Design a protein around this ligand. Structure first.
Ligand SMILES: O=C(CCNCc1ccccc1)Nc1scc(-c2ccccc2)c1C(=O)NCc1ccccc1
Length: 330
């Protein structure tokens, strides 16, 4: 089997991407944020504290003839950015782009943090990291991909995120029309539960490429590119007037600037992030200070190849017995 679904930016800045997911019988379609940096499939629901729902579409398990309470199971997750959610668990039928899994754990939120409430466009998350990170207790559950994998034509999924435009998540096949050149594969460590890999270096604009190992995660659920402070300083030094603002929480730059590109290495291959991808717009409405899309990972403990990087590539998440990651230009 295979599946193929369009993923759509939630706003004009590509802050996140939502993908429609069918849950239950008859189907209830929710728009979920596919997150290769976490491993829980959770949704706003008929159980979510009413004051914490503001415009989201909810899953109502009592209206699904295939829903079953997973007795005694609870979940609770904290994200790297401080947001959180928690609740109880059903199993139900879940379909993405024509690919169906029966008995998928659907984590129903009883509580969500304010950042989730405040984003009416995201109805929940669909985790695509390794199932070792799943938070369901006392019996840890599998991701959608892990449940689907044996049925897929090939044990892979691909992320093809657009810049200011829709893109695609495919399951079970590689669309050879969706990228240029060849796909370069690179080793993955699953030790921390992530799609963790090592970039071979970087360049800023038309500058010379610096060979250096940068260990980080391929994370579709993180907006920005978080890299070591040395790399990030070298980037922003090429933008007149850019500075790190402790009050804003990262590098800002004049909105009148034209940003240089940023290149990262994948083995001997190179992925170029155009400068425009690195502009996240005014820090507040009407300001002429704009927020940068490349930020330091120094406070985080891990480098993160988030959407800013991934949307410059066609990315293969290869879930073979020894997982690997592939990147192609597009
Ligand atoms: O990049 C983001 C925000 C993603 N949503 C963007 C958005 C912006 C405006 C409006 C609506 C949505 N957070 C970061 S920054 C760094 C991390 C992180 C990830 C893993 C480990 C450590 C830190 C994260 C992070 O925790 N990402 C997972 C996540 C996914 C969705 C919601 C909440 C957390």
């Amino acid at each position: 089997s295979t599946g193929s679904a369009t993923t759509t930016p939630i706003d004009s800045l590509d802050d996140a991407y939502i993908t429609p997911v069918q849950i239950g019988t008859p189907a209830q379609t929710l728009n979920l944020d596919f997150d290769t940096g976490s491993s829980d499939l959770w949704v706003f629901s008929s159980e979510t504290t009413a004051s914490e729902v503001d415009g989201q579409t909810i899953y109502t398990p009592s209206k699904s003839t295939t829903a079953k309470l997973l007795s005694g199971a609870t979940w609770s997750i904290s994200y790297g950015d401080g947001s959180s959610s928690s609740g109880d668990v059903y199993t139900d039928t879940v379909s993405v782009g024509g690919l169906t899994v029966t008995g998928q754990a659907v984590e129903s939120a009883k509580k969500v943090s304010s950042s989730f409430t405040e984003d009416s466009t995201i109805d929940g998350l669909l985790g695509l990291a390794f199932s070792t990170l799943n938070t369901v207790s006392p019996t840890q559950q599998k991701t959608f991909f892990d449940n689907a994998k044996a049925s897929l034509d090939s044990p892979v999924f691909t992320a093809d995120l657009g810049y200011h435009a829709p893109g695609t998540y495919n399951f079970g096949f590689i669309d050879t029309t969706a990228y240029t050149g060849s796909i370069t594969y690179t080793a993955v460590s699953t030790k921390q539960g992530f799609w963790e890999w090592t970039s071979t270096g970087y360049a800023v604009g038309s500058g010379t490429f610096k060979s250096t190992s940068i260990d980080g995660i391929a994370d579709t659920g993180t907006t920005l590119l978080y890299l070591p402070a040395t790399v990030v300083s070298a980037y922003w030094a090429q933008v007149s007037g850019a500075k790190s603002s402790s009050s804003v929480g990262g590098y800002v730059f004049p909105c009148s600037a034209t940003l240089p590109s940023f290149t990262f290495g994948v083995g001997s291959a190179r992925i170029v992030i155009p400068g425009d991808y690195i502009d996240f717009g005014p820090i507040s409405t009407g300001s002429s200070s704009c927020f940068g899309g490349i930020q330091s990972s120094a406070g985080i403990g891990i480098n993160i190849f988030g959407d800013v990087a991934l949307k410059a590539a066609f990315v293969v998440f290869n879930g073979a017995t020894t997982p690997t990651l592939g990147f192609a230009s597009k």
